[PDB]
Design a protein around this ligand. Sequence first.
Ligand code: HEM
Ligand code: HEM
Ligand SMILES: Cc1cc(N)nc(CCc2cc(CCN)cc(F)c2F)c1
Ligand SMILES: Cc1cc(N)nc(CCc2cc(CCN)cc(F)c2F)c1
Ligand SMILES: C[C@H](O)[C@H](O)[C@H]1CNc2nc(N)[nH]c(=O)c2N1
Ligand SMILES: C[C@H](O)[C@H](O)[C@H]1CNc2nc(N)[nH]c(=O)c2N1
Ligand SMILES: [Zn+2]
Lengths: 410, 411
Amino acid sequence: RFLKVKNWETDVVLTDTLHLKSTLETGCTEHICMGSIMLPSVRTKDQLFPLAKEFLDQYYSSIKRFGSKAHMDRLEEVNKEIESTSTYQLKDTELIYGAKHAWRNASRCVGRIQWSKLQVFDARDCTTAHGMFNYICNHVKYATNKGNLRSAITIFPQRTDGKHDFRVWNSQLIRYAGYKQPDGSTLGDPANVQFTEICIQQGWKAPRGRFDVLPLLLQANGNDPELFQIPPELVLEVPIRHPKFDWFKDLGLKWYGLPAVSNMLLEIGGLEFSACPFSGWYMGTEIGVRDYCDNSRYNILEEVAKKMDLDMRKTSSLWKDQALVEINIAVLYSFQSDKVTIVDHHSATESFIKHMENEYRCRGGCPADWVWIVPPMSGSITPVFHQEMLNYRLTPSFEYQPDPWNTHVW
Amino acid sequence: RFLKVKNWETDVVLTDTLHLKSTLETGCTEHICMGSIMLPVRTKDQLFPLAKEFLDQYYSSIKRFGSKAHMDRLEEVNKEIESTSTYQLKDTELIYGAKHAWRNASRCVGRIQWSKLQVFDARDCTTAHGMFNYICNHVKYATNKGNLRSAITIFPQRTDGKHDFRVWNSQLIRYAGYKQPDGSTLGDPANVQFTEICIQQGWKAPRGRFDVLPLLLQANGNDPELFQIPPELVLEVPIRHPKFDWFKDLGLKWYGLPAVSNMLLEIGGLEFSACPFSGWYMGTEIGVRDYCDNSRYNILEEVAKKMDLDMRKTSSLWKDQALVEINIAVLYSFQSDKVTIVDHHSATESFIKHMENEYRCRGGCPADWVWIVPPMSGSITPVFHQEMLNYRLTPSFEYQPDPWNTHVWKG
Ligand code: HEM
Ligand code: HEM
Ligand SMILES: Cc1cc(N)nc(CCc2cc(CCN)cc(F)c2F)c1
Ligand SMILES: Cc1cc(N)nc(CCc2cc(CCN)cc(F)c2F)c1
Ligand SMILES: C[C@H](O)[C@H](O)[C@H]1CNc2nc(N)[nH]c(=O)c2N1
Ligand SMILES: C[C@H](O)[C@H](O)[C@H]1CNc2nc(N)[nH]c(=O)c2N1
Ligand SMILES: [Zn+2]
């Protein structure tokens, strides 16, 4: 009930008491652990007020005014607003707090040492998809900051009846298109083949290239989604070169500077924000390990190993492993050269350990998903590999939600 | 009930029904996942249900469920439990049980081999000297001059918990570690405490970097006794690199035979507290964990020095670069000496094929993603992208306390 986590590299033991404030399910039971499952598969008036109460209780505790004059008045005011309107509206201060804590609670995020520095853009006055586009251009420009990346979230109006949802149809604000070739192969990003089709079906003029920045597909107020092209000059991209292999340029690789997730749902006080794009800066392995080397993505390992003249006949030569390191050297080198913020997996995981220790000391815990926190290369030489972690669900939270094309009454 | 796991690289979806036959706890609840946490005698009372469940599984596997042989055995074991408070396994049941404890080991990526286990029945052993003889023969058999063969040796089961057989070594073959007065460590830092016990028990330590530890063996709850494995039985591989001539001068070697000796084997409710088992290494166990953990031999710096990598900031990935070269040299060295070893690419590919086969023919394959995924290059192996369900099936291998923490010394 007062659980312990151990670091097996340093023998440091921390005691977790924050998990007793956990709420929703993990997907696990005493009979089966689902820790490696990627996704374990509107609010009536009752459901809504305790969620509001739990949130306002922790907000007012955080500002040292729990059980106080303003606390009771706010609880009473929101109660009245729910009885009347069957929902309520957050004060600006509560919305900023809720968003920073949604990030703080993201158990799959290794970069949470930064959680308190989030720039929150209140877009709750937006009414149309052209407005959403304007809000998102300003987000992209603020966050990019000429390569000195700054964390940001832009929060569009909350769900109401459920038929008037705001949605960003793109999974991320900035991603490359994917096209099926006539000969059967795939050009561009194979992960984005279906979404690219909906872009064309809704009218996109695809330039069928390999690194075509997809257009935004924005849905305001439950209406039909509309296409917009992000101003090219707002999309910072990095050509990938290697500090040793001059032939690395001829691979033609590039990637964008801004990781910006736009398909998640932000829950604060029982209220649901279905369109809440947020951005930070990349950890190098996201690009070089997953984006470039997954067999289901750009899958460049075999090409890179051939230019390195490695023995690709036997897996035990570790040729895949060697090329993988070099690819990830080049990504870091490229971003660092062009002065685009990026963090390597050693720096990011060391920061998370210090963040964990801070959260245990000052908060009593830190929910953490080891399966996602440990980087996809060189796992055991990063400090998080040796760190036991407890995973549990705290609110405010970012949650997955269904892809809108499977939901939208067109 | 059904449960589905997906492979996110291939979109293959498998359906788990075997989890319905799971038993003990995972440590998780609907409110917390303990999937990354490393760790967690019987009466006649709870024992016959455990025996019956096991015998039902045994007789089902041989297509004899409900047979007269099945019903007779259940009656026989029932009466033996009522009159003696325990029971003895037949040889055939012991072999079946040991194979299935391996098959059920959710942290083991090498389980494609589970049906080819050599089982050595040491239940007639009575003294530590007899344990030593059995373990030497296991080491010789399993080593097989480098053509390694999986084996397990099973010593007498627990009775009242005051007469346990135990192998005090966590593994049959391991190198000593010695803490120096200046705070540095010579040899394997993970073995400092066990080395100190051996020294206190009378072991004369060579005090080198790669000294094979002696066996410390406990029979029938008596005080443990020290034994030196004959050095001609301990096969070792000097580590060199196929391109770097200077690698041999690091002075590294490793033993060929991985043999776990601190775990408890549970079959049909019986507890075998001494059951050493051995297979062959996956390269990353040595080259990633043994050599490169900060808490182990920790050679990343030396190797990176001699490669003349840019060591000033971590974003040069000098650690990742040195890590790959070390694991190449381990694989190269074992293969050149014709000692069995498997790289993490081959091992994870085989495990996926094993897992898919188990879902087909058995309805599932319990698997611990946190342990299955190798400690380098995780996502370029196919297990990274495979969803896995973790649950406990018996027969099983379990952790048990270290004996020096529980042993009542005789003096
Ligand atoms: C500032 C630098 C940041 C770094 C270095 C970072 C790092 C990461 C990484 C490596 C992942 C794994 C993603 C994947 O493997 O697909 C992740 C996941 C995640 N991050 Fe962070 N992140 C940062 C900022 C943020 C911000 C600003 C937010 C929210 C305001 C956030 C929320 C999340 C969430 C919810 C996930 C889980 C995503 C999912 O389930 O797909 N991150 N982060
Ligand atoms: C035949 C070749 C084998 C290979 C390649 C193999 C591979 C592995 C590896 C790499 C690990 C993780 C070790 C660690 O990280 O400490 C492991 C764990 C394990 N293996 Fe296998 N293994 C083999 C044979 C066996 C056999 C013969 C048994 C039992 C009869 C077995 C049972 C287990 C168990 C119980 C674990 C979990 C150990 C723990 O919790 O510390 N393995 N295996
Ligand atoms: C805020 C943030 C920071 C960061 N460092 N990383 C991310 C994830 C980014 C991301 C993930 C995926 C796949 C998610 N399953 C595809 C993308 F195009 C993308 F940008 C988000
Ligand atoms: C049967 C078997 C096969 C294999 N391929 N691997 C193992 C693990 C072997 C092992 C693990 C550890 C660390 C345990 N946490 C230390 C050792 F000395 C050792 F031999 C066992
Ligand atoms: C804390 C974490 O569970 C611990 O470091 C685990 C992670 N995964 C592992 N995986 C394997 N194969 N072996 C290990 O010892 C560990 N250690
Ligand atoms: C099946 C498995 O859970 C899946 O491949 C996960 C593993 N860990 C991950 N970790 C991160 N950071 N991102 C991912 O997409 C995944 N994918
Ligand atoms: Zn779990």
